[PDB]
């Protein structure tokens, strides 16, 4: 026996402020790649269309999610990483790459989920005489692990023993980019922002621009809770979630309960179609009843 | 007779439990797949 | 005491051996489940593993540098709040980044910096008055990248007598630049050992530090009968891998 | 890694092997082909 939905429910958390797009993408200063910086994002609306009038991105690539779904989701545990690299080095900011940057400066995990953005900043970060304030590490014993940073400045020797800078086989491990106004595109500065997050498994406080509705109970409806969409019947629940739990699951891994993001009430979710049906016929040759 | 009953029940319950396998897809939850992915890749995962 | 001092005439540690007992289980994820069995694979403390004990009593003040390996289970048995936190790092000096996680008398403080760590970090409490007097964890700090301070509270720092009353358990993991922290608590009434039983831990922190962690040291409390003289109070903490 | 201090590559792509495994392998019957092209023609140097 089949039943079709006759309603629509959308439940997102109470959010008023717009996310700090200006602070992140329009900051006056950016850090060196070897000292990349991290910032937490929470309790804001991710309405990225506001960027359309002010920014143009050479690189934009997302992992674990389709770019056309971003407006319909809520994101958990959101961080933004910022730094500056050379034009030829941008390709290295991606899972499973090799090279100086990916080996010694900044590495992404193999199962990365998030997005990578990059844009040219020659007019801002390049000067006619050459700007050398941005630096990267080009010597190290071993490779970095994902989301690891190393900001030491110990003089380097292949032998591995301590050395003094003015001596053979002893080098300073940090080198300076040379950004000139007349440089080719491959040697021009680029600003990079890496966003990381998790989806549909835990509490969230960053969401896309969407209008929440009222809660309909004891009725087959389409529902959207913090981005998780489906169809079913919602009822009050006796389960008691812990503060760090947002969804519940049964032995089939079907999502069977959820905490409402506005009232914190626990709701059970049940399928709409249920029941066995049989048809008795005397034969179509004899009748159609 | 008891084990006839038990075998039938166990078969059905195993059928219910086997819905939690990924079969190589990114997830075993159709709702999660359709909430995250657009139609083109959702089709591959759902086919698996 | 303005700088950090080294205790004189301190007995060397006795790495006493004990066994875990179905301890150290934690919640693997954030999904709600009930009335079910769940098979999972992760970094766990195997049942009846060998654990090492460290003690503060009389003239023994055990706080060596301990390897981190692939993650730690750390359980403290106490009655007067002697163990106050940890320092995690790689070289344990100002040549690299270290993270301090402490519970001072009024706040929980977490800080990641280039620390000029002192080889003997401790808090000082006066026995006659029962008030915290000094904190001597580090001499200098710079290039700080992460900081967290909790809401204020009040702790009973005074010395106590009798049997150990509180068992506080923690699990520490390091993965993809995050330091996972799990916590659990139990009331106890024992004398010397690590009680046997089962108790599940809950997630508390997921700190985005992005540092290499290979070594850790515990931060303890020293009870001074009089200004200048250093004493100790009974307490124990146990480590497993 | 000796190249890191002297060369910068606009294009680097590998087929049949992961770039992060190169340091752990031995290679059989190795050849290197060299030539020069135009910027717009680089994309044509790929299978298919
Ligand atoms: C439980 O017992 C095991 C052994 O059954 C202890 O693990 C052992 O820990 C020692 C001390 O770190 C390891 O020795 C060191 O290993 C390497 C390789 O040599 C190196 O760091 C040092 O040179 C030193 O030899 C030893 O390898 C390791 N044994 C095994 C089999 O892994 C463990 O510590 C005990 N649990 C405790 C003490 O809490
Ligand atoms: C436990 O640690 C916390 C965190 O450091 C201590 O609280 C902090 O105490 C410092 C002084 O040691 C305060 O700095 C000063 O506070 C006021 C702010 O109006 C003012 O005098 C100065 O501008 C300066 O900022 C700091 O504010 C305070 N932090 C917080 C969050 O309250 C606390 O004192 C420590 N407890 C013990 C018993 O040592
Ligand atoms: C980690 O801390 C070290 C030690 O303080 C920092 O190195 C220092 O950084 C400053 C600021 O860039 C360097 O600037 C120097 O200042 C004056 C002029 O302003 C003059 O002494 C020099 O011409 C130079 O510009 C300073 O040389 C440098 N000191 C040392 C001993 O290396 C370092 O920047 C910190 N790292 C991070 C990632 O924050
Ligand atoms: C998008 O940006 C454009 C360009 O800056 C804005 O239009 C300008 O508005 C200023 C302020 O009134 C005028 O002086 C310029 O002449 C406008 N430029 C034009 C008309 O080409 C526009 O207002 C911005 N839109 C939004 C929605 O913020
Ligand atoms: C989100 O905002 C809504 C709307 O104000 C809050 O829901 C109301 O909360 C008040 C105060 O407790 C109640 O009297 C109302 O009955 C609630 N419902 C409505 C429709 O007004 C809700 O509490 C807020 N949620 C959080 C987590 O702060
Ligand atoms: C890092 O720690 C070392 C070791 O404690 C400090 O070395 C001291 O350096 C000063 C200044 O040169 C000397 O007067 C001291 O004698 C050194 N040793 C000690 C034990 O004090 C060092 O200064 C610290 N900081 C830096 C930036 O190197
Ligand atoms: C990597 O290349 C750099 C740049 O050429 C080398 O550093 C230079 O070394 C020469 C020769 O001593 C000096 O004259 C330059 O001033 C150095 N440039 C600097 C310090 O920016 C460096 O030696 C090379 N490293 C290795 C390991 O070969
Ligand atoms: C300021 C911090 C924002 C945090 C991001 C929030 C939620 C998770 C991800 C959202 C996608 C934002 C990227 C917008 C890219 C614009 C593309 C273009 O213009 O071509
Ligand atoms: C960005 O910062 C610049 C420099 O202060 C300022 O002029 C501009 O209005 C800011 N916003 C945008 C969208 O560029
Ligand atoms: C098929 O059709 C007739 C007319 O409806 C029906 O009554 C009859 O039973 C059928 N013929 C048979 C069964 O031979
Ligand atoms: C430490 O162990 C030794 C034997 O190795 C023993 O003789 C001594 O009494 C012990 N000391 C303490 C304080 O436990
Ligand atoms: C500590 O000192 C007391 C008092 O002298 C003594 O009875 C006790 O045995 C000592 N304990 C240890 C472990 O040395
Ligand atoms: C390459 O050849 C040039 C020209 O002879 C020479 O100056 C240079 O040292 C050689 N090596 C590198 C790494 O460029």
Give structural notes:
This is part of a larger assembly, with four copies of chain A. The first copy, chain A, is mainly β and 289 residues long. In chain A, 5% of the residues lie in helices and 28% in strands. Chain A contains three helices and 15 strands. The first copy, chain A, has helices at residues 21-25, 100-104, 122-125; strands at 8-11, 37-41, 44-45, 59-63, 74-86, 114-120, 135-137, 174-176, 189-199, 206-207, 221-225, 228-236, 247-249, 255-259, 266-270. In chain A, the strands form three sheets. In chain A, strands 2, 3, 4, 5, 6, 9 and 10 form a seven-stranded mixed beta sheet that branches. In chain A, strand 11 and strand 12 form a beta hairpin. The radius of gyration of chain A is 27 Å and the shape is elongated. Chain A starts with 7 loop residues before the first strand and ends in a 19-residue tail after the last strand. Chains in contact: A-B, A-C, A-D. Chain A binds chain C through residues 38, 40, 77, 79, 109, 145-152, 154, 201-202, 239, 241-242, 244-249, 251, 257, and chain C through 29-34, 36, 95-97, 143, 176-178, 202-203, 206, 208, 210-212. The structure holds a molecule of 3 linked components (NAG-NAG-BMA) (3 copies), a molecule of 2 linked components (NAG-NAG) (4 copies), linoleic acid (EIC) and 2-acetamido-2-deoxy-beta-D-glucopyranose (5 copies). Residues 14, 60 of chain C line the site of one 2-acetamido-2-deoxy-beta-D-glucopyranose (NAG). It is classed as viral protein. Keywords: Coronavirus, viral protein. Cryo-EM Structure of Spike Glycoprotein from Civet Coronavirus 007 in Closed Conformation. Chains A, B, C, D: Spike glycoprotein. The organism of A, B, C, D is Civet SARS CoV 007/2004.
């Amino acid at each position: 026996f089949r039943v079709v939905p006759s309603g629509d429910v959308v439940r997102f958390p109470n959010i008023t402020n717009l996310c700090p797009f200006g602070e992140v993408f329009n900051a006056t200063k950016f850090p060196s790649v070897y000292a990349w910086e991290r910032k937490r994002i929470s309790n804001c609306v991710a309405d990225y269309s506001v960027l359309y009038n002010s920014t143009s991105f050479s690189t934009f690539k997302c992992y674990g999610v389709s770019a056309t779904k971003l407006n319909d989701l809520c994101f958990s545990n959101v961080y933004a990483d910022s730094f500056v690299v050379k034009g030829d080095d941008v390709r290295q900011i991606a899972p499973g790459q090799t090279g100086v940057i990916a080996d010694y400066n900044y590495k992404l995990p193999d199962d990365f989920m998030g997005c990578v953005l990059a844009w040219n900043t020659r007019n801002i970060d390049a000067t006619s005489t050459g700007n050398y304030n941005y630096k990267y590490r080009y010597l190290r014993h071993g490779k970095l692990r994902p989301f690891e940073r190393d900001i030491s400045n110990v003089p380097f020797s292949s032998d591995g023993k301590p050395c003094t800078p003015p001596a053979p086989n002893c080098y300073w491990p940090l080198r300076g980019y040379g950004f000139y106004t007349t440089s080719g595109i491959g040697y021009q500065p680029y600003r990079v922002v890496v966003l990381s997050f998790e989806l549909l498994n835990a509490p969230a406080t960053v969401c896309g621009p969407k209008l929440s509705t009222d809660l309909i109970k004891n009725q087959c409806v389409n529902f959207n809770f913090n981005g998780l969409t489906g169809t079913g019947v919602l009822t009050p629940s006796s389960k008691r979630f812990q503060p760090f739990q947002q969804f519940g699951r049964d032995v089939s891994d079907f999502t069977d309960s959820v905490r409402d993001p506005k009232t914190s009430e626990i709701l059970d979710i049940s399928p709409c179609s249920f029941g066995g049906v049989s048809v008795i016929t005397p034969g179509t040759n004899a009748s159609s009843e | 007779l008891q084990d006839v009953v038990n075998q039938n029940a166990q078969a059905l319950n195993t059928l219910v439990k086997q819905l939690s396998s990924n079969f190589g897809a990114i997830s075993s939850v159709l709702n999660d797949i359709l909430s995250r992915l657009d139609k083109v890749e959702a089709e591959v995962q759902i086919d698996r | 005491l303005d700088r950090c001092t080294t205790f004189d005439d301190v007995q060397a540690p006795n790495y006493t051996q004990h066994t875990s007992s179905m301890r150290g289980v934690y919640y693997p994820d954030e999904i709600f489940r009930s009335d079910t069995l769940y098979l999972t694979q992760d970094l766990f403390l195997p049942f009846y593993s060998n654990v090492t004990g460290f003690h503060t009593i009389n003239h023994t003040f055990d706080n060596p540098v301990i390897p981190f390996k692939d993650g730690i289970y750390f359980a403290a048995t106490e009655k007067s709040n002697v163990v106050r936190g940890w320092v995690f790092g790689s070289t344990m000096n100002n040549k690299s980044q270290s993270v301090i996680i402490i519970n001072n008398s009024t706040n929980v403080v977490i800080r990641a910096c280039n620390f000029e760590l002192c080889d003997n970090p401790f808090f000082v409490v006066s026995k006659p008055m029962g008030t915290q007097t000094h904190t001597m964890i580090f001499d200098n700090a710079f290039n700080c990248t992460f900081e967290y301070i909790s809401d204020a509270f009040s702790l009973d720092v005074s010395e106590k007598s009798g049997n150990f009353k509180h068992l506080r358990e923690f699990v520490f993991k390091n993965k993809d630049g995050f330091l996972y922290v799990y916590k659990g608590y139990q009331p106890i009434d024992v004398v010397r050992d690590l009680p046997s039983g089962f108790n599940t831990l809950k997630p508390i922190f997921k700190l985005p530090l992005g540092i290499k962690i290979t070594n850790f040291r515990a931060i303890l409390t020293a009870f001074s009968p009089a200004q200048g003289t250093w004493g100790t109070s009974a307490a124990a903490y146990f480590v497993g891998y």
